[PDB]
Design a protein around this ligand. Structure first.
Ligand SMILES: *[C@@H]1O[C@H](CO)[C@@H](O[C@@H]2O[C@H](CO)[C@@H](O)[C@H](O)[C@H]2NC(C)=O)[C@H](O)[C@H]1NC(C)=O
Ligand SMILES: [Cu+2]
Ligand code: NA
Length: 227
Protein backbone atom coordinates (compact mmCIF):
# COMPACT_ATOMS: atom_id res chain seq x y z
CA UNK A 1 0.00 0.00 0.00
CA UNK A 2 1.17 3.46 -1.00
CA UNK A 3 1.11 6.00 -3.81
CA UNK A 4 3.38 8.41 -5.67
CA UNK A 5 3.55 11.64 -3.65
CA UNK A 6 6.14 13.61 -5.65
CA UNK A 7 7.74 13.51 -9.08
CA UNK A 8 11.15 14.98 -9.92
CA UNK A 9 11.59 15.72 -13.62
CA UNK A 10 15.09 16.78 -14.60
CA UNK A 11 15.54 17.99 -11.02
CA UNK A 12 12.24 19.93 -10.84
CA UNK A 13 9.66 18.94 -8.24
CA UNK A 14 6.05 18.24 -9.23
CA UNK A 15 3.61 17.33 -6.49
CA UNK A 16 1.81 14.03 -6.91
CA UNK A 17 -1.88 13.34 -6.51
CA UNK A 18 -2.15 13.14 -2.73
CA UNK A 19 -4.81 10.45 -2.58
CA UNK A 20 -4.54 10.53 1.22
CA UNK A 21 -5.74 14.15 1.29
CA UNK A 22 -7.04 15.71 -1.95
CA UNK A 23 -10.17 13.47 -2.25
CA UNK A 24 -11.35 15.02 1.02
CA UNK A 25 -10.78 18.70 0.23
CA UNK A 26 -12.83 21.21 -1.71
CA UNK A 27 -10.20 22.75 -4.02
CA UNK A 28 -7.23 20.41 -4.46
CA UNK A 29 -4.37 21.77 -6.58
CA UNK A 30 -3.84 21.06 -10.24
CA UNK A 31 -1.02 18.54 -10.68
CA UNK A 32 0.57 16.47 -13.45
CA UNK A 33 -0.60 13.31 -11.67
CA UNK A 34 -3.95 11.69 -12.35
CA UNK A 35 -6.56 11.80 -9.62
CA UNK A 36 -7.77 8.42 -8.40
CA UNK A 37 -10.38 7.04 -6.03
CA UNK A 38 -7.89 4.58 -4.47
CA UNK A 39 -8.31 6.18 -1.06
CA UNK A 40 -7.48 2.90 0.70
CA UNK A 41 -3.95 3.41 -0.77
CA UNK A 42 -4.60 -0.01 -2.29
CA UNK A 43 -4.47 -1.77 -5.60
CA UNK A 44 -6.25 -3.12 -8.64
CA UNK A 45 -6.28 -6.91 -8.60
CA UNK A 46 -6.97 -9.39 -11.39
CA UNK A 47 -10.73 -8.93 -11.15
CA UNK A 48 -10.09 -5.47 -12.61
CA UNK A 49 -7.60 -6.25 -15.37
CA UNK A 50 -10.28 -5.93 -18.06
CA UNK A 51 -11.90 -2.86 -16.46
CA UNK A 52 -10.85 0.80 -16.79
CA UNK A 53 -9.49 0.67 -13.21
CA UNK A 54 -6.27 -1.02 -14.41
CA UNK A 55 -5.36 1.88 -16.72
CA UNK A 56 -4.40 4.56 -14.18
CA UNK A 57 -5.90 3.07 -10.98
CA UNK A 58 -9.48 3.04 -9.76
CA UNK A 59 -11.63 5.99 -10.80
CA UNK A 60 -8.66 7.76 -12.33
CA UNK A 61 -8.99 11.03 -14.23
CA UNK A 62 -6.25 12.93 -16.09
CA UNK A 63 -4.14 15.42 -14.23
CA UNK A 64 -4.81 19.03 -15.18
CA UNK A 65 -1.12 19.75 -15.89
CA UNK A 66 1.54 18.29 -18.15
CA UNK A 67 5.28 18.51 -17.43
CA UNK A 68 7.95 19.15 -20.10
CA UNK A 69 10.77 16.62 -20.08
CA UNK A 70 14.11 17.00 -21.84
CA UNK A 71 15.30 14.47 -24.44
CA UNK A 72 16.16 11.25 -22.65
CA UNK A 73 15.39 13.11 -19.44
CA UNK A 74 14.76 11.55 -16.07
CA UNK A 75 11.47 11.17 -14.24
CA UNK A 76 11.85 10.16 -10.59
CA UNK A 77 8.67 8.90 -8.93
CA UNK A 78 8.83 9.22 -5.14
CA UNK A 79 6.50 6.83 -3.33
CA UNK A 80 5.25 6.83 0.22
CA UNK A 81 7.25 4.18 2.14
CA UNK A 82 6.84 0.89 0.29
CA UNK A 83 6.42 -2.29 2.37
CA UNK A 84 9.21 -4.84 1.99
CA UNK A 85 6.61 -7.62 1.89
CA UNK A 86 5.18 -6.23 -1.36
CA UNK A 87 7.79 -7.93 -3.56
CA UNK A 88 7.39 -7.67 -7.30
CA UNK A 89 8.26 -6.01 -10.58
CA UNK A 90 8.30 -2.31 -11.39
CA UNK A 91 7.05 -1.54 -14.90
CA UNK A 92 6.80 1.69 -16.89
CA UNK A 93 4.69 2.47 -19.96
CA UNK A 94 3.99 5.47 -22.16
CA UNK A 95 0.84 6.15 -24.14
CA UNK A 96 0.59 9.02 -26.64
CA UNK A 97 -2.14 11.53 -25.85
CA UNK A 98 -2.31 12.84 -29.44
CA UNK A 99 -3.32 16.18 -27.97
CA UNK A 100 -3.84 17.52 -24.48
CA UNK A 101 -3.34 14.76 -21.93
CA UNK A 102 -5.78 16.48 -19.58
CA UNK A 103 -8.67 15.75 -21.99
CA UNK A 104 -7.85 12.15 -22.94
CA UNK A 105 -10.32 9.29 -22.74
CA UNK A 106 -8.20 6.83 -20.77
CA UNK A 107 -9.81 3.75 -22.33
CA UNK A 108 -8.39 4.80 -25.73
CA UNK A 109 -4.78 5.07 -24.51
CA UNK A 110 -2.40 2.63 -26.22
CA UNK A 111 0.55 1.94 -23.90
CA UNK A 112 3.99 0.69 -24.86
CA UNK A 113 6.38 -0.68 -22.27
CA UNK A 114 9.49 1.50 -21.87
CA UNK A 115 11.13 -0.17 -18.85
CA UNK A 116 10.66 -3.26 -16.75
CA UNK A 117 12.48 -4.72 -13.77
CA UNK A 118 11.55 -8.01 -12.15
CA UNK A 119 13.27 -10.64 -10.02
CA UNK A 120 16.85 -9.57 -9.30
CA UNK A 121 18.08 -12.37 -7.03
CA UNK A 122 16.35 -15.38 -5.52
CA UNK A 123 19.04 -17.06 -3.44
CA UNK A 124 16.91 -16.43 -0.32
CA UNK A 125 13.20 -16.64 -1.24
CA UNK A 126 11.09 -14.63 -1.65
CA UNK A 127 14.20 -12.87 -2.97
CA UNK A 128 15.17 -9.40 -4.13
CA UNK A 129 12.87 -7.69 -6.61
CA UNK A 130 12.60 -4.36 -8.39
CA UNK A 131 10.34 -3.30 -5.53
CA UNK A 132 13.25 -3.88 -3.14
CA UNK A 133 15.48 -1.75 -5.37
CA UNK A 134 12.75 0.92 -5.21
CA UNK A 135 12.71 0.74 -1.40
CA UNK A 136 16.49 1.02 -1.17
CA UNK A 137 16.50 4.09 -3.43
CA UNK A 138 14.57 6.28 -0.99
CA UNK A 139 11.28 4.61 -1.99
CA UNK A 140 11.67 5.91 -5.52
CA UNK A 141 12.09 4.86 -9.12
CA UNK A 142 13.79 6.70 -11.96
CA UNK A 143 12.55 6.29 -15.53
CA UNK A 144 14.51 7.53 -18.52
CA UNK A 145 12.31 8.69 -21.38
CA UNK A 146 13.42 7.07 -24.68
CA UNK A 147 15.11 9.39 -27.17
CA UNK A 148 13.76 7.41 -30.12
CA UNK A 149 10.00 8.10 -29.76
CA UNK A 150 8.07 10.84 -31.51
CA UNK A 151 7.79 13.96 -29.32
CA UNK A 152 4.46 15.13 -27.99
CA UNK A 153 2.22 14.61 -25.00
CA UNK A 154 2.27 11.22 -23.27
CA UNK A 155 0.85 9.55 -20.20
CA UNK A 156 3.50 7.78 -18.14
CA UNK A 157 1.96 4.76 -16.39
CA UNK A 158 4.29 3.71 -13.57
CA UNK A 159 3.44 0.54 -11.70
CA UNK A 160 4.48 -1.78 -8.91
CA UNK A 161 2.90 -5.24 -8.93
CA UNK A 162 3.05 -6.78 -5.47
CA UNK A 163 3.16 -10.57 -5.58
CA UNK A 164 3.05 -11.49 -1.88
CA UNK A 165 -0.50 -12.89 -2.26
CA UNK A 166 -0.25 -13.84 -5.94
CA UNK A 167 -0.34 -17.62 -5.35
CA UNK A 168 -4.14 -17.51 -5.81
CA UNK A 169 -6.11 -16.24 -8.80
CA UNK A 170 -6.57 -12.45 -8.72
CA UNK A 171 -4.08 -12.30 -5.84
CA UNK A 172 -1.51 -10.04 -7.50
CA UNK A 173 -1.85 -6.39 -6.49
CA UNK A 174 -1.28 -3.76 -9.17
CA UNK A 175 -0.42 -0.22 -8.08
CA UNK A 176 -0.46 1.96 -11.21
CA UNK A 177 0.21 5.69 -10.97
CA UNK A 178 -0.06 7.96 -14.01
CA UNK A 179 1.41 11.36 -14.84
CA UNK A 180 1.26 13.63 -17.89
CA UNK A 181 4.49 14.41 -19.75
CA UNK A 182 5.46 16.68 -22.64
CA UNK A 183 8.19 14.59 -24.32
CA UNK A 184 10.93 16.16 -26.46
CA UNK A 185 13.69 14.83 -28.69
CA UNK A 186 14.64 13.88 -32.22
CA UNK A 187 12.86 10.53 -32.26
CA UNK A 188 10.20 9.48 -34.74
CA UNK A 189 9.03 6.04 -33.54
CA UNK A 190 5.37 5.47 -32.75
CA UNK A 191 5.73 2.11 -30.98
CA UNK A 192 2.93 -0.43 -31.11
CA UNK A 193 0.65 0.09 -28.13
CA UNK A 194 -1.68 -1.98 -26.00
CA UNK A 195 -4.89 -0.81 -24.38
CA UNK A 196 -4.63 -0.67 -20.60
CA UNK A 197 -7.39 -3.30 -20.38
CA UNK A 198 -5.25 -5.67 -22.50
CA UNK A 199 -1.98 -5.42 -20.54
CA UNK A 200 -2.57 -8.24 -18.08
CA UNK A 201 -4.48 -11.47 -17.64
CA UNK A 202 -4.93 -13.09 -14.26
CA UNK A 203 -3.33 -16.33 -15.57
CA UNK A 204 -0.08 -14.73 -16.76
CA UNK A 205 3.03 -16.54 -15.47
CA UNK A 206 4.34 -13.42 -13.71
CA UNK A 207 0.93 -12.71 -12.17
CA UNK A 208 -0.31 -16.10 -10.92
CA UNK A 209 2.83 -17.18 -9.12
CA UNK A 210 4.12 -18.45 -5.78
CA UNK A 211 7.19 -16.36 -4.91
CA UNK A 212 7.85 -18.32 -1.69
CA UNK A 213 10.22 -20.70 -3.44
CA UNK A 214 13.42 -20.49 -5.46
CA UNK A 215 12.38 -19.22 -8.89
CA UNK A 216 14.91 -19.77 -11.65
CA UNK A 217 13.18 -17.17 -13.83
CA UNK A 218 10.37 -14.63 -13.74
CA UNK A 219 8.42 -13.48 -16.78
CA UNK A 220 7.62 -9.81 -16.25
CA UNK A 221 3.98 -9.38 -17.29
CA UNK A 222 2.72 -7.04 -19.95
CA UNK A 223 3.51 -6.47 -23.60
CA UNK A 224 7.06 -6.60 -24.98
CA UNK A 225 9.59 -3.98 -23.97
CA UNK A 226 10.06 -1.29 -26.62
CA UNK A 227 13.64 -0.52 -27.64
C1 LIG B 1 13.47 10.98 -0.61
O1 LIG B 1 12.07 10.87 -0.67
C2 LIG B 1 11.44 11.93 0.07
C3 LIG B 1 10.00 11.56 0.33
O2 LIG B 1 9.38 10.86 -0.74
C4 LIG B 1 11.66 13.24 -0.68
O3 LIG B 1 10.97 14.28 0.01
C5 LIG B 1 10.42 15.32 -0.83
O4 LIG B 1 11.42 16.26 -1.28
C6 LIG B 1 10.92 17.36 -2.06
C7 LIG B 1 12.12 18.17 -2.49
O5 LIG B 1 12.83 18.66 -1.36
C8 LIG B 1 9.92 18.16 -1.24
O6 LIG B 1 9.40 19.25 -1.99
C9 LIG B 1 8.79 17.25 -0.80
O7 LIG B 1 7.87 17.98 0.01
C10 LIG B 1 9.34 16.07 -0.01
N1 LIG B 1 8.26 15.17 0.38
C11 LIG B 1 8.24 14.54 1.55
C12 LIG B 1 7.05 13.65 1.79
O8 LIG B 1 9.13 14.68 2.38
C13 LIG B 1 13.16 13.50 -0.69
O9 LIG B 1 13.46 14.65 -1.46
C14 LIG B 1 13.91 12.30 -1.28
N2 LIG B 1 15.35 12.48 -1.13
C15 LIG B 1 16.17 12.64 -2.17
C16 LIG B 1 15.54 12.64 -3.51
O10 LIG B 1 17.38 12.80 -2.02
CU1 LIG C 1 -0.26 -3.03 0.39
NA1 NA D 1 12.98 -4.50 -26.62
Amino acid sequence: HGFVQNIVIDGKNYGGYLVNQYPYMSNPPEVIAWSTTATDLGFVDGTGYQTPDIICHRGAKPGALTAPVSPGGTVELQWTPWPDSHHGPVINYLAPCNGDCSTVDKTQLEFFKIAESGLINDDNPPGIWASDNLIAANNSWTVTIPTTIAPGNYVLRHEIIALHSAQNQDGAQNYPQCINLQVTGGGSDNPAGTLGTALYHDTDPGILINIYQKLSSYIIPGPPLYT
